[PDB]
Write a protein that binds this ligand. Sequence first.
Ligand SMILES: Nc1ncnc2c1ncn2[C@@H]1O[C@H](COP(=O)(O)O)[C@@H](O)[C@H]1O
Ligand SMILES: Nc1ncnc2c1ncn2[C@@H]1O[C@H](COP(=O)(O)O)[C@@H](O)[C@H]1O
Ligand SMILES: [Mg+2]
Ligand SMILES: [Mg+2]
Ligand SMILES: [Mg+2]
Ligand SMILES: [Mg+2]
Ligand SMILES: [Mg+2]
Ligand SMILES: [Mg+2]
Ligand SMILES: [Zn+2]
Ligand SMILES: [Zn+2]
Lengths: 320, 308
Amino acid sequence: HMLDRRSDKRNNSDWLQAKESHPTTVYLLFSDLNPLVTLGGNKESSQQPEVRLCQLNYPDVKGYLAQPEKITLVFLGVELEMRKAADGLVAWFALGIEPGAAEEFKQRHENCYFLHPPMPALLQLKEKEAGVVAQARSVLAWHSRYKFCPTCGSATKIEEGGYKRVCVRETCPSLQGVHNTSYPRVDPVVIMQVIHPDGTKCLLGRQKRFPPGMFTCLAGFIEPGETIEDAVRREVEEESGVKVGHVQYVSCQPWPMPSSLMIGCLAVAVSTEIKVDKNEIEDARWFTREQVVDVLTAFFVPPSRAIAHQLIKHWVGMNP
Amino acid sequence: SHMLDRRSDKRNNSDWLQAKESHPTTVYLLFSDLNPLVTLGGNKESSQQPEVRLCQLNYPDVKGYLAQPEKITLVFLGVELDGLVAWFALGIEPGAAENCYFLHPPMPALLQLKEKEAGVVAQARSVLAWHSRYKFCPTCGSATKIEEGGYKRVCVRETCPSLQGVHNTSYPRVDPVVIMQVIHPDGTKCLLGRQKRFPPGMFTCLAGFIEPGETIEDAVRREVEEESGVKVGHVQYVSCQPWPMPSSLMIGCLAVAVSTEIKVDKNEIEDARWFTREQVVDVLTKGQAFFVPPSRAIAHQLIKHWVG
Ligand SMILES: Nc1ncnc2c1ncn2[C@@H]1O[C@H](COP(=O)(O)O)[C@@H](O)[C@H]1O
Ligand SMILES: Nc1ncnc2c1ncn2[C@@H]1O[C@H](COP(=O)(O)O)[C@@H](O)[C@H]1O
Ligand SMILES: [Mg+2]
Ligand SMILES: [Mg+2]
Ligand SMILES: [Mg+2]
Ligand SMILES: [Mg+2]
Ligand SMILES: [Mg+2]
Ligand SMILES: [Mg+2]
Ligand SMILES: [Zn+2]
Ligand SMILES: [Zn+2]
């Protein structure tokens, strides 16, 4: 990650309040969960215009901050190097604002714009910036849909730097002991590059909503009581009929749509017959290594920053 | 291999689920306050020591509970691996709850179940626990209704945003947790810690929840450094263990420290130390003024994996 989350500061109201108006503090502005970005404008993002975060400071956002009931403020962390309250730490916050306010901003700064739609525009951000966006967007998305207490239905209030919501009903069981109802949600999702029993093909599928010709790795949410490997085997068989043996973890990608942790795996199929569950996917097929090589250089796959692309590209290079 | 095929394709088949409720081969697992009904001994597996196993009930054992649907919670677990033997979990109230008994307390008594039965309890307990604490719509606060064999809750307010599109507010929660065996730079020691609440002498792997926006490996590095001050480099995934307290997925990793100095937070972790392979070997066998979780806990499996 690009920041140190400094979760120990989340219950330090005085420190958080002081940092809000400190001149070194960085703000990332969000409207309807979309981050404010800019194209080009420095050396790295120049040779072809690259999308980068529009980093704001207190003088840019002070008017939003002075209406706390209309904003959602999340402490993201501090920069990894300290500069020469006044502790040398450079704080970052995510600031979610109302649409009226965002319009008045868009007329104020012409070079910055809100990134949308989230898929695939978030894949345009460089890795370090994409990670902080995934943190900020996932927490703001949680706040947008978890305003009421799941245990009793009452209103809740934000606490702990944006990382906790607390029911206002004093008698509520959610307030006795520690419960996940207080805290942001992380949904684990397995996504799997599935290799044919003969090592020369891989299994890819699509949903009816996908652009014509796009195919990608099968994926699904891990269920309660399931391991990573269990979910890979179950989801592949559900959607495509294919039975899976060995499952190998490869890498992760946080995917803030709203709050998914993509757990990327390589899996070896032990059967070949395909039986598509139309209620989930429209199509699943075996693609030869040669076909996939042709496409990485009559179907196509997600862009290179998507984990599915990284899994497919990794496989193309493995020893058959 | 597993006890059950989840057959999630059946969860929206209300006619099939209903037919199975009274079928003579259907098995029910009874839960009181999220604790499973179990039994000790009584088959070939206990010829040596009495072993805990699930107390499998059938329709005539639970039919009085089913006659009061507003007082129970019913979850379709799957079919054994139409000839299909359906399993359900049935959560009841403490009042309604002599060779069976409710397994309590969950830590460490759940660790007495054999792995294949532990997997079914983790499924059932976590879904039941979700229903206990997620009865209202997080998006608007209205009441909700159970659907899909116990795997969905649906807001009763027709205009609610939760009903336009697909949203995680409808579905069971799974909380990813990293737990990590952390090896000293010199390769000869591992880092273990404890909380004040722990029984005296107990040490275990550090662990913590993955945050929004974070990878497995970054959560390991962040939590180790938060809790113990130790900085971590390489992180390797090893294996998982679902832990239904209420709904955690323990993601077990081996990590290499790149610093040596410990600095404990004295808020979550009251103590953390480097333990040599010899100290740990002694404690996996039996001799040391400390001890670790039992063998079915993923921390014990990770510590064992490390010593070879
Ligand atoms: N946490 C969640 N967020 C969104 N959808 C979920 C979640 N858990 C289960 N689902 C269901 O999972 C479906 C997607 O299938 P899959 O991604 O293959 O598991 C969605 O259409 C939902 O019905
Ligand atoms: N899903 C969750 N369930 C319970 N506690 C959580 C959750 N997410 C964050 N927390 C917090 O994490 C603390 C435990 O620390 P750790 O397990 O080391 O991350 C709890 O006491 C809560 O304050
Ligand atoms: Mg899927
Ligand atoms: Mg699924
Ligand atoms: Mg699926
Ligand atoms: Mg911890
Ligand atoms: Mg911790
Ligand atoms: Mg933590
Ligand atoms: Zn409440
Ligand atoms: Zn609602």
